[PDB]
């Protein structure tokens, strides 16, 4: 989570009625936009993030959000316009000795503005003294580990996030839905749609 | 709800090595600093040391000399080992975990173990 | 050695402002903390960083710490206050754990 990673998606065509119709998300949360109307609308631009938090995490994930994530590993905006998905991921983030490769930042003397990302792993200094590389008294390392095992409970184990940032700014719609066609009739008066011209 | 538990010999010989192990119950022996505390009879409380989960260790300077403090992770214990032990070291030790709020754990000791009383008798 | 020194016993009457004194040469440039320890238990932490008190500890417990002296204010002193309270500091120069000697507060 710490180091979310983010695709940038332009310049073509999803159908999000795979996606807003599969029960493989155990949180689907869209704001500023219908999840159903996906398909229905165009953005200049979309950004694909990605990371990994436990159960209890996942609701900080959401605009005028605030705690460990939120502040210290991914903020988002207040004004966020997309939507949110998330699945559990115990079967392949957890293991029985503790999967430690998931980290999340612990320690931070500021928050994170929206769509930060902070990879520092340098000695959080909690004192006057320097820590100078050398951990102790007021010298902690900034990133915990969640140590993910399948026996922790839903709010402790894994789940994959996945965050779809749409921008429909003022460049040309590049992102859209594929809107199914019909069948076509010859030598009936008919209403015809041909790539919008109607 | 993190719990400390101390044991060992009631009665230790003057000279000898004083083992105590403490063992942390309901939670992670990492990520904070353990410490010994000894309340010697009609004496406040006197610290001893402390050790990180890294293996970072710091002793008083007046028992510096005598004290060792380890860590086993493995066992979520740590161990006190005190050399020479005389008559002043007849008291009670206790263990505490240092008080670590947003991360950052303060010269506090929030949680405390109920204590175990050696007495260096011959 | 950095010391700290606090009065043998503080004697207060149930109702009433009860005052521990610690004190120490630049304790005001230390982090203070207090810890109260009952016949028979271990020491608890009732208040810590001169001002902050741990979940669970009454409001009635203060602490507050001015130039070389610290002071535990416990105010509407209870039957269940009698014990023995203790302020401690950290030494960055030692890099170690300096404890009071000790206050025995007592509830005629």
């Known amino acids: 989570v710490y180091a979310w990673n983010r695709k940038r998606i332009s310049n073509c065509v999803a159908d999000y009625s795979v996606l807003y119709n599969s029960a493989s998300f155990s949180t689907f949360k869209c704001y500023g936009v219908s999840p159903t109307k996906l398909n229905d609308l165009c953005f200049t631009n979309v950004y694909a993030d990605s990371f990994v938090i436990r159960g209890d995490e996942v609701r900080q994930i959401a605009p005028g959000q605030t705690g460990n994530i939120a502040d210290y590993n991914y903020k988002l905006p207040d004004d966020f316009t997309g939507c949110v998905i998330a699945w559990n991921s115990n079967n392949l983030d957890s293991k029985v000795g503790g999967n430690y490769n998931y980290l999340y930042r612990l320690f931070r003397k500021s928050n994170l503005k929206p769509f930060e990302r902070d990879i520092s792993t340098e000695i959080y200094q909690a004192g006057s003294t320097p820590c100078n590389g050398v951990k102790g008294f007021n010298c902690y390392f900034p990133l915990q580990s969640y140590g993910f095992q399948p026996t922790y409970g839903v709010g402790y184990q894994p789940y994959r996030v996945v965050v779809l940032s749409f921008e429909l700014l003022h460049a040309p719609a590049t992102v859209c839905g594929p809107k199914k066609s019909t069948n076509l009739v010859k030598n009936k008066c008919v209403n015809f749609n041909f790539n919008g011209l109607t | 709800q993190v719990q400390l538990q101390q044991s060992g010999p009631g009665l230790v010989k003057p000279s000898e090595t004083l083992s105590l192990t403490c063992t942390v119950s309901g939670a992670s022996i990492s990520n904070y600093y353990w410490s010994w505390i000894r309340q010697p009879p009609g004496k406040g409380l006197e610290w001893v040391g402390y050790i990180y989960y890294t293996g970072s260790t710091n002793h008083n300077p007046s028992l510096k000399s005598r004290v060792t403090i380890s860590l086993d992770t493995s066992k979520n214990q740590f161990s006190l080992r005190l050399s020479s032990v005389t008559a002043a070291d007849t008291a009670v030790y206790y263990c505490?975990?240092?008080?670590?709020?947003?991360?950052?754990?303060?010269?506090?000791?929030?949680?405390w173990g109920q204590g175990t009383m050696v007495t260096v008798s011959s | 050695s950095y010391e700290l020194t606090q009065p043998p016993s503080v004697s207060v009457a149930p109702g009433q402002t009860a005052r521990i004194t610690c004190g120490g040469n630049?304790?005001?440039?230390?982090?203070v903390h207090w810890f109260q320890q009952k016949p028979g238990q271990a020491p608890v932490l009732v208040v810590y960083d001169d001002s902050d008190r741990p979940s669970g500890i009454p409001e009635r417990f203060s602490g507050s710490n001015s130039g070389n002296t610290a002071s535990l204010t416990i105010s509407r002193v209870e039957a269940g206050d009698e014990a023995d309270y203790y302020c401690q500091v950290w030494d960055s120069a030692s890099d170690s754990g300096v404890f009071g000697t000790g206050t025995k507060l007592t509830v005629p």
């Open positions: 630049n304790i005001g440039s230390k982090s």
């Open positions: 505490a975990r240092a008080y670590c709020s947003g991360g950052s754990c303060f010269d506090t000791f929030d949680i």
